Every structure is written in C-alpha cells, then in structure tokens.
C-alpha cells in the first residue's frame, strides 16, 4: 500500500525462464512474478506463454498498488521477451517506453564451455 501510480518494469528473459520485476521510478521493487510463481515448474517457464502469464500477474499485482503507467526495461535474449512486452502493452498498464539494457561485457571474463568459441 504505497500508491506509486507510475514506475518501471524490468524483464529478465533467459532461455530457461522469464521473470518480471515492477519497481518505482527509483528502481526499488514493489511486486514481481516469474514462470515459477505461476504453476509452471520445469522447462515450461522458458515459454513465451509462461512469460505472458508472468507479465500479466506482475501487472495485476501492481494494480493493487494503483499503478497506471510504466517504463519497460528489457534484459537478456530469451524466447518470451516480446511476448512479455506485448502482455504488458495491453494490460491496462500504459507502457511509456521500451528500452533494451542487456548487460554486454567489453570482453572481461571467460565464459563457461557452453558459451565458448568467443570472448
């Protein structure tokens, strides 16, 4: 119960799960959701439909705090990013700006064998 009425929406989309964190304009979170907060347990979380459900659930939780407009921030390349985008877009929440802010290094650390053949 804070009545923020305007904040940010971070989307963390990986190939294994999509998780949505709704925060205030300073970044402090309010509510959140993910594929695991919905009934989906295993690989079904890395599904665009699961991402849609997570986005809609986080949006409905933010409705309790009476929030209307959000600023969307996307991080990570994963199946279900655009589906969460389109879920938040038409959810009653006014989407003011969508921004991709995926953290890309300047070739700092050595990846795992899974991500090798690169630097």
């Amino acid at each position: 119960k804070r009545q923020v009425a305007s904040g940010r929406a971070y989307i963390h989309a990986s190939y294994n799960n999509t998780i949505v964190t709704i925060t205030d304009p300073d970044g402090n979170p309010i509510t959140w959701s993910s594929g695991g907060v919905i009934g989906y347990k295993g690989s079904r979380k890395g599904t665009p439909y699961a991402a849609q459900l997570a986005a809609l659930d986080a949006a409905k939780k933010a409705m309790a705090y009476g929030m209307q407009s959000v600023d969307v921030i996307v991080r990570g390349t994963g199946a279900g990013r655009e589906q969460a985008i389109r879920a938040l877009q038409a959810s009653g929440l006014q989407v003011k700006s969508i921004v991709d802010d995926t953290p890309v290094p300047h070739n700092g650390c050595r990846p795992k064998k899974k991500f090798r053949k690169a630097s």
Binding site: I98, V99, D100, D101, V104
Partner: protein, 73 residues
C-alpha cells in the same frame, strides 16, 4: 546497404584529430555509444583509424559515452 546518408558527406570541414570537439564526434556514434563502421561514416582506412583513437580519447575525458541504451524496441 546504408543508403540513408554518409556522415562525411553530411558534414563539412573538420579536424579528425580534435578529441575535444564533441558535437561533431556525436555524429560518428550510433544510437548506442558504439563507433559506427566504415559503411556508415564513409571515411577512409586512415581517416577511420584516426577517428577511432580520437573517439576513445573523448570517451576517457568524459565527453563521449562508452555505451548507451536502445529506445523504442
């Protein structure tokens, strides 16, 4: 094929070694803080090579960005 406009052709007389001229080096960066390739800038090999180091200097001085964020995705 980058048929919109060349940065050099959309510009006049300028110094390629001036790391303090921010408003002219801003044109040579993309929407992100990244340095534009040759197909976008329309510079020569030597020109682009000098531009790279001058942009890096302008970045270290705090004038140009190392990286920006993408909007309207």
């Amino acid at each position: 094929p980058s048929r919109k406009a060349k940065v050099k052709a959309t510009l006049g007389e300028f110094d390629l070694r001036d790391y303090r001229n921010v408003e002219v080096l801003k044109r040579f960066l993309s929407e992100t803080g990244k340095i534009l390739p040759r197909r976008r800038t329309g510079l020569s090999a030597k020109e682009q090579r000098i531009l790279a180091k001058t942009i890096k200097r302008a970045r270290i001085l705090g004038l140009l960005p190392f990286t920006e964020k993408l909007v309207r995705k």
